[PDB]
Design a protein around this ligand. Structure first.
Ligand SMILES: Nc1ncnc2c1ncn2[C@@H]1O[C@H](COP(=O)(O)OP(=O)(O)O)[C@@H](O)[C@H]1O
Length: 413
């Protein structure tokens, strides 16, 4: 087991906390601050328990090892943090080097400091692109020095950056202080997924949809050993329907690599008695456009040529609803339609309503982060499901049964 924040004595201690502040932006201004909010409990705790300082560190976007302050600065996060925290947050313009080090040697008894975006330095990811756009690899010597500089900012280290936990980056596995402790966001996320995967309340339903039909492979195969039911929705379904049922799918998303094992996966489900729910009907579109001409189809009719299926239909949502009703526990990863467009958002909307009714009655509902977490924000259901993950990719690594380098890097009790 690992050291965690509650076990950690901070009093008088400078805390360098890795957090995931990689919030969606538009035109420099934050569109979702959930990732920020989620870190608050760890930060406050340190403040309330007498920390000399919290020096926060994160990445935003993918600047690829070149500094891009015009486009990917964390400054706006500082402003949000201070508002959240009802306290001052001092933003630094770099994350390493003498100046930053001076700022972080001995702050006051409670000063919050935010570092600039980690990824401006190629040493964080260990690789990136140079200013001319060329793929480059960072240098071991330079990587150690970078790692050393982060080390100085703090007496002790805390990782609350669950969403970045799958990334073996310098700030996540390279900060070599004596005590490295997992924050409250880390413990909470890990605990939910672990409980859901190891000892779920049953029946356990996984809802898989979205697009990323191929990446959902290791995931389904693992889930197939954990679950009692699975909805396979959204873009992914079409590959299953064409293969199993010889559906005419038009221009709908199709995944050739995926089509190869669809039969294997289905037989595994049959073996395990996992009831698989695929869509039986669809909202079609004449083109991939918000204002496209719409239509309806079924597995049996096909989708016209060469229309595409962009939402499930009414029968499908009902069958989805039947599964939600039976479930004691739900993991939902991926929307079941192109929810960003009104024409194609009904199936997702109806699924959200059902999941929401289920929470209400004690079904454990876990939402996968990424696009699904986005639906919650959009529709105000963030506080009406048991947990909305802050990490899409990291959660998948977890659902896939993989280990997280961010978790592993922590100190052992
Ligand atoms: N039938 C469909 N055809 C094409 N795109 C779809 C379909 N259903 C959902 N999508 C798209 O899938 C995306 C979500 O993909 P993904 O990243 O896998 O979900 P998440 O981020 O929740 O894990 C959205 O951009 C959505 O518009």
């Amino acid at each position: 087991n690992k050291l965690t924040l509650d076990k950690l004595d901070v009093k008088g201690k400078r805390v360098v906390m890795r957090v995931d502040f990689n919030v969606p932006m538009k035109n420099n201004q934050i569109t979702n601050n959930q990732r920020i909010k989620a870190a608050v409990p760890s930060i406050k705790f340190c403040l309330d328990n007498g920390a000399k300082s919290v020096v926060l560190m994160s990445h935003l976007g993918r600047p690829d090892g070149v500094p891009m302050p015009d486009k990917y600065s964390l400054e706006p996060v500082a402003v949000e943090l201070k508002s959240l925290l009802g306290k001052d947050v001092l933003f630094l313009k770099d994350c390493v080097g003498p100046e930053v080090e001076k700022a972080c040697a001995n702050p006051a008894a409670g000063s919050v400091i935010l570092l600039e975006n980690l990824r401006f330095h190629v040493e964080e990811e260990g690789k990136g692109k140079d200013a001319s756009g060329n793929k480059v690899k960072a240098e071991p010597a330079k990587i150690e020095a970078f790692r050393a500089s982060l080390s100085k900012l703090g007496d002790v280290y805390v990782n609350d950056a669950f969403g970045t936990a799958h990334r073996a980056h310098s700030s996540m596995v390279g900060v070599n202080l004596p005590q490295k402790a997992g924050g409250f966001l880390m413990k909470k996320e890990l605990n939910y997924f672990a409980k859901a995967l190891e000892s779920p309340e049953r029946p356990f339903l996984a809802i898989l949809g979205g697009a990323k039909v191929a990446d959902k492979i290791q995931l389904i195969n693992n889930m197939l050993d954990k679950v009692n039911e699975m909805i396979i929705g959204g873009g992914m379904a079409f590959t299953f329907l064409k293969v199993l049922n010889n559906m005419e799918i038009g221009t709908s998303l199709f995944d050739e690599e995926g089509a190869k094992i669809v039969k294997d996966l289905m037989s595994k489900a049959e073996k395990n008695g996992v009831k698989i729910t695929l869509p039986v009907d669809f909202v079609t579109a004449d083109k991939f456009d918000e204002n496209a001409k719409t239509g309806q189809a079924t597995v049996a009719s096909g989708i016209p040529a060469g229309w595409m299926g962009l939402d499930c239909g009414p029968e499908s949502s009902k069958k989805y609803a039947e599964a939600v009703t039976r479930a004691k526990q739900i993991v939902w990863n991926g929307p079941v339609g192109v929810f960003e467009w009104e024409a194609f958002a009904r199936g997702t909307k109806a699924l959200m309503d059902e999941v929401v009714k289920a929470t209400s009655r004690g079904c454990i509902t876990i939402i996968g982060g990424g696009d699904t977490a986005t639906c919650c924000a959009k529709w105000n259901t963030e506080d009406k499901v048991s947990h909305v993950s802050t990490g899409g990719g990291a959660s998948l690594e977890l659902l896939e049964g993989k280990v997280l380098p961010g978790v592993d890097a922590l100190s052992n009790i």
